[PDB]
Amino acid sequence: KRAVITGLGIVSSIGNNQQEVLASLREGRSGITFSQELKDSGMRSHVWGNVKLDTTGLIDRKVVRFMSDASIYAFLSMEQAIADAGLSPEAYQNNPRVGLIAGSGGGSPRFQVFGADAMRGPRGLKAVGPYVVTKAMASGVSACLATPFKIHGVNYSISSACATSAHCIGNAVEQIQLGKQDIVFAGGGEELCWEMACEFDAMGALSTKYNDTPEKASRTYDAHRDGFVIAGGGGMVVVEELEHALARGAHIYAEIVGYGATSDGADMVAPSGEGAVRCMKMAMHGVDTPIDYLNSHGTSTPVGDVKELAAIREVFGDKSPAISATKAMTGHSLGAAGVQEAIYSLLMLEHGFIAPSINIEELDEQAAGLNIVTETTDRELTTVMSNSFGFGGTNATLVMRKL
Amino acid sequence: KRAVITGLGIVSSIGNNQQEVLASLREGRSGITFSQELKDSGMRSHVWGNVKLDTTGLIDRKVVRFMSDASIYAFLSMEQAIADAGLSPEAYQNNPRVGLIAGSGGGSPRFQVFGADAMRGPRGLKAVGPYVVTKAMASGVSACLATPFKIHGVNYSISSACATSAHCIGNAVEQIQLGKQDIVFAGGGEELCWEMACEFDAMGALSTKYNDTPEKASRTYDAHRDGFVIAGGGGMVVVEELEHALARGAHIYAEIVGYGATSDGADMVAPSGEGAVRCMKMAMHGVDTPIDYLNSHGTSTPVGDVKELAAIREVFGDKSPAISATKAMTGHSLGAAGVQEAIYSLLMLEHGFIAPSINIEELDEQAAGLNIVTETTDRELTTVMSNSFGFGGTNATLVMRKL
Ligand SMILES: C=C/C(C)=C/[C@@]1(C)SC(=O)C(C)=C1O
Ligand SMILES: C=C/C(C)=C/[C@@]1(C)SC(=O)C(C)=C1O
């Protein structure tokens, strides 16, 4: 029935491990840089939320030859989670009660585009090769991790655009609740490339006025925000059944006491708000303790930002929780955003502090009577909430509490 | 607690609705044709499992601007399932207890490539446009249906390659069991294009020796099968809680009495057998009636075919059910294969007959343990099983029974 997080792993724009990520968060350090690749592709947005790591010989050649970047990022995060959970092969491999639910928002537009380019070349099929399917397939993140880690339980991905890894964790929780699994590795990954980024720029979703000052581009709630800053990376958490965890002396960050998954059924590319309201309310249902901190989806987009503020306010009313949008620091890793931000929230719960909402030179008047924390402040948190939304009116909310 | 199917919709290579599909099945009619597109693309495989329907104007212009083919196919299938189920707008729209779980195997390689191609032109972003994200993103099938159809419940896709739509239905069942939803539209869609097909051909997965005789290319269990015949299309079923279905007098096809979801944790692109055995057995927990008919995944590939037959052998021993691989007729629609074949199984349960396993000119030596019906056989069926597997060692099994 009860699901808890007993391990985490992360490869992000602000850190290649939970320790480095902790640093950046408490420091309020930006992971955004100028991208030549993006500028070079023809894009208007030239700022990145890139992973600063040379992944070259980190994954075995036979295993890595099937993967794309989203898979690599999630695979490395999974290793970190396996290690950090205290799990050994004999404990998680070839075991029907151990599963994997992880995905990405866009799969691999790079290798999808590589296979097409290679195919139209004079060598066609031979230029494409036998590994494009596993690299480009939408289920790449799950397929590429489940096989090498010899997972025997559930094995699939959930895709809900900018909310995918959040739904992945919520689904893992349901597997434990249904008594189907004891452990489920949940999370996701996302590649960073002009191939996919250009699509978002094409719809005017990305920031384009701060290319000269990359670290100031992502400015959630700032009156002059102009779109989100795309990013790549991965994250993975170990969702485990309470008794099982306690039984093996597992270290427990918190327990997932709430999971909301709703739908807007209104517009694509634009949030309705009511959808998020029901989602958050659903995640708080039964939680007998108040929400101390709220890690908003806050993408730094004109409409989105205030639309979520309007929702939060209607759900909490007078008594609103402390809020901070860590995207102003990290950027929007799309499909990886959900798990990565759940991890930042878990780190804040574990280290008693609230990461700051940076770059707010001018608070939006639409973000009036709320509590946007712009200073790294030490606080004994107990219950935290994380929101994730994506195109198509898909919403997810996770509420985590200490034991 | 209990989940039943109260409506279905389908757009496939053998039919544009349940009536045409029924006729083709009973007749063992091939939906395979020669593809100039694939031939012109430089592929060794020139046979198609195409949808014979010009979809132009079949969807509101403002609504279809966000969709790719997989989304269109699923959207049309859902239009059918809604009407079939006898659901009125007021019954399923703007309702938190009504959800949508549908996806595809590859999303939209065509629009991932179009975005990249347009980007590298003299028009760049202007040529790309603002609708490529929703078309190219992995969650397209779910995002593009949930919004127009006014869905307020769950909204996301499950992606497990050639098993995705099967896992989608299984997940919908869990939502009903967890008491979270009363109705969940489950299924998926898949586009047909050289962009995605060349990648499979590039790994030698597609049939290439029967281009001169398209209808004989897909030959599951035939000693001379040489890969699967790619296809496109959609399918959607209405998964509904039992008391709910009966309360409104919905017409129930069958109840989902079993859902297995396992993982191989062995090889990519190649099945282990073990895993599919646990998946079937898992689907069988609680089911005490015999399996009267088994709609195998049977892709018409050398290894796959006999690896699944070995697993079926292992699960049933001396008591093996009647088997038939409808892919020899329809082709492999990848992500849509699961829901489409669940529908064929539902149609056979409904009209009392077993669709034939066509093109078996020889029958692999390993298939000696017969009961693979190669002739349309009228028979009163009660419990049927459908298998779905995909790259990455992901397995799904659904068992449906008459009420
Ligand atoms: C239905 C549309 C939604 C939820 C849109 C949001 C707020 S979610 C997101 O990640 C970005 C960039 C947005 O603009
Ligand atoms: C792990 C690999 C698996 C399950 C491979 C299968 C049998 S699934 C499928 O649709 C095809 C074409 C195959 O070859």
UniProtKB/Swiss-Prot annotation, chains A, B:
The keyword S-adenosyl-L-methionine belongs to this UniProt entry's keyword annotation: no
Protein name as it appears in the record: 3-oxoacyl-[acyl-carrier-protein] synthase 1
Top class in the EC scheme: transferase
Induction: Mainly activated by FadR, but minor repression is also conferred by FabR.
Family according to the record: Belongs to the thiolase-like superfamily. Beta-ketoacyl-ACP synthases family.
Protein's organism: Escherichia coli (strain K12)
Main location: cytoplasm
Residue ranges constituting the Ketosynthase family 3 (KS3) domain according to the UniProt record: 1-402
EC number: 2.3.1.41
Location of the protein in the cell: Cytoplasm
Function recorded in the entry: Involved in the type II fatty acid elongation cycle. Catalyzes the elongation of a wide range of acyl-ACP by the addition of two carbons from malonyl-ACP to an acyl acceptor. Can also use unsaturated fatty acids. Catalyzes a key reaction in unsaturated fatty acid (UFA) synthesis, the elongation of the cis-3-decenoyl-ACP produced by FabA. Has an absolute requirement for an ACP substrate as the acyl donor, and no activity is detected when both substrates are based on CoA.
Source species taxonomy: Bacteria, Pseudomonadati, Pseudomonadota, Gammaproteobacteria, Enterobacterales
UniProt GO cellular component terms: cytosol
Superkingdom of origin organism: Bacteria
UniProt subunit comment: Homodimer.
GO biological processes: fatty acid biosynthetic process; monounsaturated fatty acid biosynthetic process
